[PDB]
Amino acid sequence: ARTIRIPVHMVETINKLSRTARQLQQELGREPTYEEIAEAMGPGWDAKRVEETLKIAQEPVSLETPFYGDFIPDEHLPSPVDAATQSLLSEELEKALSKLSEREAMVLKLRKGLIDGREHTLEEVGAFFGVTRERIRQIENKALRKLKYHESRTRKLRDFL
Amino acid sequence: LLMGVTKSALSTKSWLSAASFQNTTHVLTEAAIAGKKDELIGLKENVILGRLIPAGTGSDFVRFTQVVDQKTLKAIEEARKEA
Amino acid sequence: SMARPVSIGEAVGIVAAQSIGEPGTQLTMQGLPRVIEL
Amino acid sequence: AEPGIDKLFGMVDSKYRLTVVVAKRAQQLLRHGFKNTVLEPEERPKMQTLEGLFDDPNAVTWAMKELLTGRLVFGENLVPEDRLQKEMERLYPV
Amino acid sequence: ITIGIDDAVIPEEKKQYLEEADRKLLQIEQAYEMGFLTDRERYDQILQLWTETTEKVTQAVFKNFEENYPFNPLYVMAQSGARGNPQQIRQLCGLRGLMQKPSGETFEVPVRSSFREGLTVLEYFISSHGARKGGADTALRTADSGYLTRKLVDVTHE
Amino acid sequence: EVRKVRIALASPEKIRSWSYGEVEKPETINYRTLKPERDGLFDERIFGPIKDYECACGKYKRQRFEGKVCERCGVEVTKSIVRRYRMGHIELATPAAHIWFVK
Amino acid sequence: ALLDNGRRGAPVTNPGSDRPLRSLTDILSGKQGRFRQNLLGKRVDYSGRSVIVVGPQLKLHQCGLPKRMALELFKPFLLKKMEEKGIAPNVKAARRMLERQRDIKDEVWDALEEVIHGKVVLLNRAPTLHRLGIQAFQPVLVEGQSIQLHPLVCEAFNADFDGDQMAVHVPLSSFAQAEARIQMLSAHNLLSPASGEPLAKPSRDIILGL
Amino acid sequence: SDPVRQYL
Amino acid sequence: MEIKRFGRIREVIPLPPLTEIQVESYRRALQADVPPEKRENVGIQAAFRETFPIEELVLDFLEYRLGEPPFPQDECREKDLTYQAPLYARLQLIHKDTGLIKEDEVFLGHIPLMTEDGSFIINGADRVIVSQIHRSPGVYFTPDPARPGRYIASIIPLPKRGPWIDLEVEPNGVVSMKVNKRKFPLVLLLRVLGYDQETLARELGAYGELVQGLMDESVFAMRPEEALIRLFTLLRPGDPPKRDKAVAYVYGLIADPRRYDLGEAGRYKAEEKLGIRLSGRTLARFEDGEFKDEVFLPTLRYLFALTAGVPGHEVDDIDHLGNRRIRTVGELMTDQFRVGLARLARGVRERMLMGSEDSLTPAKLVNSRPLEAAIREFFSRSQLSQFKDETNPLSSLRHKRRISALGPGGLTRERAGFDVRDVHRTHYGRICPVETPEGANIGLITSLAAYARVDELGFIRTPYRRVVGGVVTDEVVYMTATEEDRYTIAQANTPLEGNRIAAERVVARRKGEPVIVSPEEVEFMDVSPKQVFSVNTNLIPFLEHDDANRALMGSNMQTQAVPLIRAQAPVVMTGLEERVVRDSLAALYAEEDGEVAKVDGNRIVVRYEDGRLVEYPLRRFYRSNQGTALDQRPRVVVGQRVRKGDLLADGPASENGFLALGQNVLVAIMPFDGYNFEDAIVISEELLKRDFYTSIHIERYEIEARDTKLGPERITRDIPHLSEAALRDLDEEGVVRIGAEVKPGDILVGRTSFKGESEPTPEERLLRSIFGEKARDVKDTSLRVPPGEGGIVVRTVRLRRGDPGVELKPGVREVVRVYVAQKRKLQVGDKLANRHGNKGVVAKILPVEDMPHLPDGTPVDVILNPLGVPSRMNLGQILETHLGLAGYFLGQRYISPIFDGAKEPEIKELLAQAFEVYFGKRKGEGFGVDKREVEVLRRAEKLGLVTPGKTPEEQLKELFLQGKVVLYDGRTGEPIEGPIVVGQMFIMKLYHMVEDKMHARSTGPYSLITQQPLGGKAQFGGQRFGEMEVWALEAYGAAHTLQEMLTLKSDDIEGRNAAYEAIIKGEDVPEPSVPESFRVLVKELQALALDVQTLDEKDNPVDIFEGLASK
DNA sequence: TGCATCCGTGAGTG
DNA sequence: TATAATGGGGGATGCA
RNA sequence: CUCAC
Ligand SMILES: Nc1ncnc2c1ncn2[C@@H]1O[C@H](COP(=O)(O)OP(=O)(O)OP(=O)(O)O)[C@@H](O)[C@H]1O
Ligand SMILES: [Mg+2]
């Protein structure tokens, strides 16, 4: 019945919430709070869990509701402004693959994850140049500290926030 | 045979124009059945395709008109004299 | 629009359509029904 | 209106060809840094900034002026594309 | 150039025309009560008479304007083509004219007053029918017209 | 250059030729992780990657892998734009009639 | 119900509503269809809209474009011109300068003037009944919020001043600019394409005076 | 034409 | 000050409570103040008595009650709740077998209450339930459009309470019948009622073409049972004609007072039309084992005698106001209370037959969900439930007095033709002939007349004084339309001496149509000229000189008047501007006599005669629905003796108890260098200086912080990568301080949200590890200020979860509302309008030294072009301008009644009394006549305005009596070559301003599927370049501009990103690629099993998807 | 005579 | 997983 | 529902 399929037992729980809250409303003369529900449910039930259960019990709505999907932006795809700066960040950065070197501007690539997407520790990285976890460190900090001096003279990367 | 403007617009050779007009289903079915190809001749076709319309600056009559200064026009005619 | 021989590439059909349509829509805001009937 | 637009309409057999010529010449001037201009310093269109008279950034206006001078050749099948591109980029670097 | 209520000059021929109209109306009513004419002939003749009178008072307005007040703002704007037309000016100075019944037929009782003189609630209410019908006419025809436009564009775009 | 646009009838074989995998479950996305379901209406194994050059389980995570379908989850690592492109399909039991050509 | 919902018998609706679900037919066909809504007419960037107003001091090929609108509509050009001079380090900083209203200096409004020199804009009023429903105009930067429109063109657009509004559009290319300046310029389109008679003619005040 | 009545 | 009023007509009865159409309706529906023992069977009571008792166990209804609202009105507006009262009902369970009796008071939910002004408060927003006009129930007889000599009889019940029955006589002599799109001879149905052939010749029996033409032997040869069975087989193909099914269906569709319900009004209507009586709101009944008839036979009798030549038989006009009725708020609320009750009864029936047929209680047997959902649906989604128009006090009043023909149960947009839109002759004094929207809604949405009221049957009543013989009585007789059509009704202005008709001949009306009649043949008379118009229409002075097409505009444009901070009553009034302020409940008055104890800007304390000390809180700067600040200001000083019904406070757009929509200004009617071209308006800068046309506008900026599967959103003052310069006006929590200047781009409320798997890609990881500062886990999602918005923060509302009294929606932690008010001065673009239709945009703002001024240095304020006058035919504004000119020097304000107002010679007299003050002061001041005034006098003498051979004083008097004066152009000093009309005019600033409507967009949000820019200023959307604009660019031949408009500036993602990147670097734009929405089209066609192929010239497929859709 | 299909544009607000 | 329960709740035009 | 036509 649901667009978002829910495990049967969970559905049963939600139904229990519905009937309980309905009873509470019928007897109080008003709608119940999370606390009254949590109390009437029994042990192990607090307001938080009731609220969360009600949060996952939400039915998604249609886009073509008189449309509703026309007032909804596309957060995924990069805009021209986004695509621009990202294409200006890489540009103003491979200006640093230069000033450094070939192996310097690569320990940083593994460490920061430019190549594989994941950050390789100075441990794993040692098995690609032979060096141990303290020539790598000096290999890294020589890069950054040099790049830090390459800053404040080109002063390009500041605003890039 | 005299035909109304609507019927004549739907009976056109282009299935894109006919579909974009009215009776989209009735047009698309009979178009897909006959394996119809749209030559992209009219305006609405090239509009849907997002191409340059075959009218005005997009007319083939004036599309490929070239502009060259006499200085360069002569500067190229020298190398194209001998070998 | 320029009182001279038409420039090649002129979208004649669109101009005609708008030239017939414009008065009708404006002279609304046994006339138009007859026009449509024709 | 546009300066001497009647003359330009007299130059062509269709106004759209004129438009194409103007646009293409504008792109030509824009890509070569105006160096390929057939205008003399006194004929060069100018804008009045807070500093003073500087050359007009609008390459379209430039194209129309140059077209008014009569120092431009128009028509179809005059010169192959790649040849014109190569030679012009040679004479006026980018 | 300005607009005052005294710029809506009521021609002096109006009273005479209304009198003659009333006496002819009386003559046709004599031709009705006595059974000399039917109810069709009566209504038609009344309509014709009042339209004719309307024309008369229009010509009177424009003539008096031309001869006695050639620089009158209304006459100026009307003649020059700046704003206004003979009918509207006639409504402003002469009479409002005959009005429309909601069905489409015409009230045999015209609106003798003008905007300068001021109408009665009855005349106003009578005019409201025609005004309403006009607005509805516009609103209902616009769609048809635009539709036609799109048809033409579609049939001639190539 | 494009100068023609042809419309034609799609055979079941053509439909399967477009497709990248049969949709078997009427399930949309995970009701907890908010990720798509396996063989569902939003499965990435069929339609394509959700993020640019990244699989589901996060194994192959960048452009060094492209076209390489993961083994653990089974998702290709191309541009995430492909989910606006790659067609799916549903293999019916008893064939049905296209309502257009009928009515 | 998937291909053409509501075609045969009754249309399938979601529980709790009498609303037929949008099938693949309802998406493509209709005035709200994909064709008439997204192929034969789209929404565009580099386009603004404002209440118009009469600008008698304007020449036939001119219009009064507010500096606020012109700022946004010519933003990418301006970000370049602010780098070619020195009002900003680069383009990103230049854009992050115009973000907050307080951070806008005075040299910006001059650089913007330096940008739009020669290039024109396109004024459009709905309903665009004919070709002259959209016309090209050389923009003149003004204060306030309203767009100043030439009097003589108020007949083609059918634009009075009882609360009307117009939309602006910016030809980007050196081709789109030439098309507008040569073919779409109001001073070039004096006569009517329908009858041949002058459409840009003295009316109202202009007549009343003479 | 009605699946319900037809099935009934 | 001196207030001079005209008019000779003595209006007897005053205007009825203008909001009573909803008050008296809803209050009659609920009857909460009436003890349940003395309640009539109307409204909620009738709903309970129609739904109950429940047949299976038998659940029976006893009584109901309404409690007090859990939250007050202002608190409901505050916390986004509904102003409602808890409903309880006493139900008893009766076991029809045993006799078991269990009784309990069940809670059915809440019912939204109507406030004092006749509005509602649903989910924190004010709303109005507009009354609905519809074709009244009963029996009608319309001529068959296909057959001229024949007539169709129609039986109409209340909407969704029965089907429509047609009795079209088919071409065969015998009458047929049409129900539920089916058709069958009426004979068979006639047999079921127990009608023998003799009863059809005895009761009827007159025309052998109809009476004996109905009789067919092949139907008479069967018992009522057999005939009933046959008809059941005729109506439902597939259902076995069982005797207990046919009776159930037929009864349940015609004779059952549950599914079929004729109107009470409809009852009386049918009773009067057929000349009979009806035992109940139904066509037939089940009595004594068989069926007994009530309606069908007299209906047939009337129908057959209509085809003949019988007196008393006429065709009914369906647009008649005697055959059309008004369903008010109470009835509309009832029809959604009955449905929600019938669904509750279903939940009861489906629970009485399973569970425990002895161990049940009215408590656990009743589920009120469908009822709550029903009422909530009617108040939160109905077409007649509208967002309240409380721009100014008048707007809400009009909104509540409007009448819609649309909505569920009425007409659709395509169902509305010409006839329903027209102004019927019976609209006289009931429905305003003037007040109606211009456009597609004309004739559908209307308004109620001033003296008009709706009776118990839903019909509109209009008052008429009785005239017996010749004496006009003070007895006022409210009549309906059909009641009006009986007598001859003279006009209200007809000459009267005391209480006697003095006119030798009077102008009267017989059935709407006008007729000149003698004073003896006069039975009734109009009570006032104001009775035939709306409220806004009655606020237009000199309306008898205004054209309807512009008067309509006048009325609709008053509604849009923004409450000015220096608002003032017009110098020319009609009289209603006081009552309107009264009934709108914007101003504050005294309940009893006494003395004011204290006066403050926040409160007013009064010591009454009763000795009781009452404190009246003043509503200070409250934001209405449309943004116009509704603020009350005190008008009394400490210790002021006050009588009953006296003013205590002035609401927004209200001055001393008078309606102050706009302001009185010095206007000169003349052209001005083109800045007056086409309705445009030129204003003096002296209007902005003394704050004329300046108003306060408030805008709320709500924000939510919720719990995510990534982490909680925190309202903080800590925002990553920011500066103190941007966080200056924020408090310690992160909310903007109260009383700060906010501009576009400024942070109103700080907020941080955790990023997902967007944990910086190595391009950003490396940058972070380069700049030294590490990447945070929270990102800036702070509520900023939209471009073009701003003002001063006056209020902050912070609601949280875990704080006493407030529980938010599931998932949401905390909600913050920033109230930002602004003081808007008049500027270039704002729309001004008078009460006569004249409107325009402020085109030019001139300094005072350029303004055409009077010779005594006094400059004008507004310059209105005369060209906007002749074609618009609205001379009322001119007549307002002259008397206004007189009122500017005499220091007077006037009350000129509608159609019985200030005539020309009286204005001449007043102007003559004004000229002596305007001119006479200068002659004893050591000043004669100016030199240029003589030139103006020369030209004017040539204009035929003044008399040749007269002193300049006399001639200038002749000009001043014509409303014209000498005007000096400030730019030169030289006079205008002629006399200009200058006076005082009531001009209002309208809701349409440029600060709102000015919008621009370089780039921004795109739609999901289409990838095309959004639509709207709020979403920073682009302008739609529709089909017609494309037709324009095509007609021009602008190919590349069109291609730009179709690609780079729209959905060509590659092309658009490349374009922006091309412009920001100073390059020429790239060649556009194929649109994304076209690919969307292709895939949407493939999903329809259609192979769309983009081929080249060799018919070989070209991939526009670029190897992304192919395996 | 039944069914299916059309019925103007752009923009604002909740 | 086992009392028994068995059939629902406008408006005009083109085309077959 | 409102603005413009
Ligand atoms: N844009 C709107 N803004 C405010 N109220 C609206 C709007 N559209 C409709 N309404 C309300 O709905 C009532 C009428 O709506 P109607 O049903 O005619 O529109 P609709 O059918 O929803 O339009 P569409 O089908 O284009 O969405 C109006 O009288 C008004 O109360
Ligand atoms: Mg306008």
Ligand SMILES: [Zn+2]
């Ligand atoms: Zn993986």
